[PDB]
C-alpha cells in the first residue's frame, strides 16, 4: 500500500514519481513514553500493523535447469514428468502430472519443485527447495529452445513470492535520515490516546533531535497535520521561506484556524494508568518509508555442522550453517581478561 | 470510603445516542476504573470476523495473502452471543461445528461485454462483474443454522467495501470460516471504531474581564464556550463541554494572568463508536459485565503454593 | 495498491468511500476539503487515507495475460 506524501516538493509532479510510491503517511508522536525507544529505536502500534502498515513482499526467481553438463551433442538424458516405477506419492500433493509445481502452492524447505524422471538411472528423481524461508509459487514459465528441436522442455523458470511482514528489527526511516530499528510492537490499549481518540502509529524519541539537528522533521509534522485537516497539499521546496516568513508562523496559522494548538501540541492521556500526562505533546503526520535489510536476512546460529576439509574448522556461511569468527582482536581481549580457559 | 459513599455520588448522564456512536458522561468515578472500561471495549469484548480463507481458485492480479487479509477486516452483522467459542485444542475432526463457525463464499468471473458503447471508459459498462464488492459474499448455512439465523442473515455491516478488481479471463473463488475472537489477539475482532474519554475542561477566570477586551477574550475559544452577559459586561462560562482545549489564550500576553486552565479529574466524557456488529450501548454493558466476571472468576480459584 | 479497508490508526471502516469520493470530486466538482467531511471523516487519522491514496491497481490491470490484446 503505497501513498503519496502530503508535504511534497514541486518536482514530485513534474518528474512523475507518484507512479512509484515509496512510503506511508504515518501519524508520529514525539514522546519518550515506553522506555523501549531510546538510542535510535522506534515503536510501532501493533493494531496499526495488523491492519497492514508497511506490508511488503519479496519476489525471487530460480531457474530449474538440466540442459547443463550435457557435452554438446548427447541425447536428452533426463526428462521432465513422472515415471512408471514406485515414487512416494506425496510428491503428487505438490507437483502436477508433468513434473511442474501447481501455481499457488505453499513450499517449505524440503518440498519438491520439479520431478524429473531420469532414464540412465531408471528412477523418478526430484529437485528440492533449498532456502529455509517458506515461500509460495507465483509463476512458472516453460522456456523453449531458440535453436532447433531439442524439445523435451530443458529450461523452466520458477518465481517464488515471499511474505515480509514488519517484524521487530526492521529498519524504518523518515525523509531526513532518522534511520531507526523497530524495537517493540506496542499494544494499542497501552498507547497514549489523544482527546479525539487517535492513538499514534510511530513513537519516536525526542532525544534523537538535539545531536542530529533535524529541524526539517519538526516542520514536516506541522505541515502534515495542517494539510490533512483542510485537505490541501503543502509546498516544501527549499528556499521559499526566509527570516521574516518562517514556516512555523505559517503552518501554525493554518492549525489555529482549524481549532488546534498553534504550536502543534495535543493534550494526550496515558494508556497504562489512564491519567493525563504532564505536558501537551507533539504529534503530526510524517511521511515515512520502509527500508530493506530485514532481520530475517541477518541472523545465524550454529551448533555443529559442515566443516572445512583441510583444517577441520567450520565454513564461511549463513547459507551453509557456518560459524562466526574469533579473530585476532577477540583473541587479545580474552587474554586481557585473564581468562585462559575461555581462550582454550 | 464505602460503596454507599460511591452509590450516592456516582452519576451517569447520557448526552446523545445513535446506532453508530454514543456520547455519555461519567461523573464521580476514579480514573483507575474509568480507564478499566476503556481497555476492555477495545481489547476484550468478542466479535466475529473471518479467520481462515480457503482458496479454490484465484487468477486475479491481487495476490492471495493480501486478498485473504482484506476479507478479514470486514465487520459482519452477526450477534456474537449467537455463536460459541472455538476450541483450539482439537484437530479438524472436532474443531468446526455448526455452533462455532459461519461459512461465507465468494464466486465471481469477469468477461467482456459486447454491448460496449465505442470509446467508453468506465468498467461498470465495459466489463461484466469487474468490481468485486463486499456484498458478493454469500451466507452458507450448515446444520441447524437455517432455523437459527432465519430471522437475521449474515450481512457485512458496510457492504460497499471494495475487495478486488477484475479484467476478462479472471476469477475469484474462496470460502471463509468466521469464528469468535477478542480484540486482543488480532485487531480485526475489536468491535469499536474508537473508544476514548476526556476529562471535562475547567475554565476559571480570576479578574473580571470586560469591555472590548472581553470581546477579544471570547474569540480565543470555540463559539459557545465563553459568553458575555449583558448588564455587568463580564465574561462568563456558558459551557466548557464544548471546549476543545487548545490553549489559545496563553499566546496573548494580556490574558496570561487572568485565566488558569484545568480539568475536573473525575468527569469522564466517554465517546463510543461501533464498528458495525453491535449497538454502542450494548458494548458498554459488555465491558462492565466482563470486569465483574474477571473478578468473580478470580474469586473462586484456590490459591496454591 | 487498492484502498485499505480499515484505517490504520483508529480502525474505522474506510475502504468503501473511495468510489463515492471520486464521484463527489468529479460530478459535483468540489475541492478535496468539503468532499472528505461530507463522507464523515472528522478526524485526521482516517482522513488522510482517502485523501492521499494512489490507486495503483489501475496500472497493474492493463498487463493482463488472459486476453489477447
Amino acid at each position: 500500500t503505497g501513498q503519496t506524501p502530503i508535504v511534497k516538493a514541486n518536482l514530485y509532479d513534474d518528474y512523475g514519481m507518484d507512479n512509484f510510491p515509496n512510503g506511508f503517511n504515518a501519524v508520529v508522536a514525539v514522546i519518550s513514553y515506553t522506555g523501549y525507544d531510546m538510542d535510535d529505536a522506534m515503536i510501532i502500534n501493533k493494531s496499526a500493523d495488523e491492519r497492514g502498515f508497511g506490508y511488503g513482499t519479496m519476489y525471487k526467481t530460480e531457474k530449474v535447469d538440466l540442459a547443463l553438463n550435457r557435452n554438446r551433442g548427447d541425447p536428452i538424458t533426463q526428462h521432465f514428468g513422472f515415471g512408471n516405477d514406485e515414487w512416494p506419492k506425496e510428491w503428487l500433493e505438490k507437483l502436477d502430472e508433468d513434473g511442474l509445481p501447481y501455481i499457488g502452492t505453499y513450499v517449505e524447505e524440503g518440498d519438491p519443485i520439479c520431478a524429473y524422471f531420469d532414464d540412465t538411472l531408471n528412477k523418478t528423481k526430484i529437485k528440492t527447495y533449498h532456502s529455509s524461508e517458506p515461500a509460495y509459487i507465483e509463476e512458472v514459465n516453460l522456456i523453449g529452445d531458440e535453436s532447433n528441436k531439442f524439445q523435451e522442455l530443458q529450461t523452466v523458470s520458477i518465481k517464488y513470492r515471499i511474505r515480509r511482514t514488519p517484524q521487530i528489527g526492521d529498519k524504518f526511516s523518515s525523509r531526513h535520515g532518522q534511520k531507526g530499528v523497530c524495537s517493540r510492537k506496542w499494544p494499542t490499549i497501552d498507547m497514549p490516546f489523544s482527546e479525539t481518540g487517535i492513538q499514534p502509529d510511530i513513537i519516536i524519541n525526542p532525544h534523537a533531535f538535539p545531536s542530529r539537528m533535524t529541524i526539517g522533521m519538526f516542520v514536516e509534522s506541522l505541515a502534515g497535520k495542517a494539510g490533512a485537516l483542510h485537505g490541501i497539499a503543502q509546498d516544501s521546496t527549499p528556499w521559499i521561506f526566509n527570516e521574516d516568513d518562517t514556516p512555523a508562523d505559517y503552518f501554525g496559522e493554518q492549525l489555529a484556524k482549524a481549532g488546534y494548538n498553534y504550536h502543534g501540541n495535543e493534550p494526550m492521556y496515558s494508556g497504562a494508568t489512564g491519567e493525563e500526562l504532564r505536558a501537551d505533546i507533539y504529534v503530526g503526520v510524517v511521511y515515512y518509508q520502509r527500508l530493506r535489510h530485514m532481520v530475517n536476512d541477518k541472523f545465524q546460529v550454529r551448533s555443529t555442522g559442515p566443516v572445512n576439509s583441510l583444517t577441520m574448522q567450520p565454513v564461511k556461511g549463513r547459507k551453509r550453517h557456518g560459524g562466526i569468527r574469533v579473530g585476532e582482536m577477540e583473541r587479545d581481549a580474552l587474554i586481557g581478561h585473564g581468562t585462559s580457559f575461555l581462550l582454550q | 470510603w464505602n460503596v454507599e459513599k460511591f452509590k450516592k455520588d456516582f452519576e451517569v448522564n447520557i448526552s446523545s445516542l445513535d446506532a453508530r456512536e454514543a456520547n455519555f458522561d461519567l461523573i464521580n468515578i476514579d480514573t483507575s476504573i474509568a480507564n478499566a472500561f476503556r481497555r476492555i471495549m477495545i481489547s476484550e469484548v468478542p466479535s466475529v470476523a473471518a479467520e481462515y480463507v480457503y482458496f479454490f481458485n484465484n487468477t486475479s492480479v491481487i495476490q492471495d495473502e493480501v486478498l485473504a487479509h482484506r476479507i478479514g477486516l470486514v465487520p459482519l452483522k452477526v450477534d456474537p452471543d449467537m455463536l460459541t467459542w472455538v476450541d483450539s485444542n482439537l484437530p479438524d475432526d472436532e474443531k468446526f461445528t455448526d455452533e462455532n463457525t459461519i461459512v461465507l463464499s465468494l464466486n465471481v468471473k469477469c468477461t467482456r461485454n459486447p454491448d460496449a458503447p465505442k470509446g467508453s471508459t468506465d468498467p461498470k459498462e465495459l466489463y461484466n462483474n469487474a468490481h468485486v464488492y463486499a456484498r458478493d459474499l454469500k451466507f452458507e448455512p450448515q446444520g441447524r443454522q437455517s432455523t437459527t439465523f432465519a430471522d437475521c442473515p449474515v450481512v457485512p455491516a458496510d457492504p460497499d467495501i471494495l475487495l478486488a478488481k477484475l479484467r476478462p479471463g479472471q476469477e475469484i473463488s474462496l470460502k471463509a470460516h468466521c469464528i469468535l475472537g477478542i480484540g486482543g489477539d488480532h485487531a480485526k475482532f475489536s468491535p469499536v471504531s474508537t473508544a476514548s474519554y476526556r476529562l471535562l475542561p475547567q475554565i476559571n477566570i480570576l479578574q473580571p474581564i470586560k469591555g472590548e477586551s472581553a470581546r477579544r477574550f471570547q474569540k480565543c475559544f470555540p463559539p459557545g464556550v465563553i459568553g458575555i452577559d449583558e448588564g455587568s459586561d463580564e465574561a462568563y462560562v456558558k459551557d466548557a463541554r464544548k471546549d476543545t482545549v487548545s490553549r489559545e489564550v496563553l499566546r496573548y500576553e494580556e490574558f496570561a494572568d487572568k485565566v488558569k486552565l484545568g480539568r475536573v479529574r473525575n468527569h469522564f466524557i466517554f465517546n463510543v463508536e461501533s464498528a458495525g456488529a453491535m449497538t454502542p450501548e450494548e458494548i458498554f454493558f459488555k465491558s462492565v459485565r466482563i470486569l465483574k466476571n474477571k473478578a468473580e472468576y478470580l474469586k473462586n480459584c484456590p490459591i496454591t503454593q | 495498491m487498492i484502498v485499505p479497508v480499515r484505517c490504520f490508526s483508529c480502525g474505522k471502516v474506510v475502504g468503501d468511500k473511495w468510489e463515492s469520493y471520486l464521484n463527489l470530486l468529479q460530478e459535483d466538482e468540489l475541492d478535496e476539503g468539503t468532499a472528505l467531511s461530507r463522507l464523515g471523516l472528522k478526524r485526521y487519522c482516517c482522513r488522510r487515507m482517502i485523501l492521499t491514496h494512489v490507486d495503483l491497481i489501475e496500472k497493474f490491470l492493463r498487463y493482463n495475460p488472459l486476453e489477447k490484446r
Binding site: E195, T196, G197, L229, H230, I232, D235, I240, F241, N242, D245, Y250, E253, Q254, K257, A258, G259, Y260 | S15, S16, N23, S196, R198, P222, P223, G224, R241, K242, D243, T244, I269, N271 | S37, K42
Partner: peptide
C-alpha cells in the same frame, strides 16, 4: 520577494467529541 501566499477560505475542522459543524 513575495510571501508564500495564504491559503484562503478556511473554517473549523475540529470540534469537541460530541459536537458538530452546525452547533457553532
Amino acid at each position: 520577494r513575495k510571501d508564500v501566499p495564504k491559503v484562503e477560505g478556511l473554517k473549523l475542522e475540529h470540534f469537541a467529541t460530541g459536537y458538530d459543524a452546525e452547533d457553532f
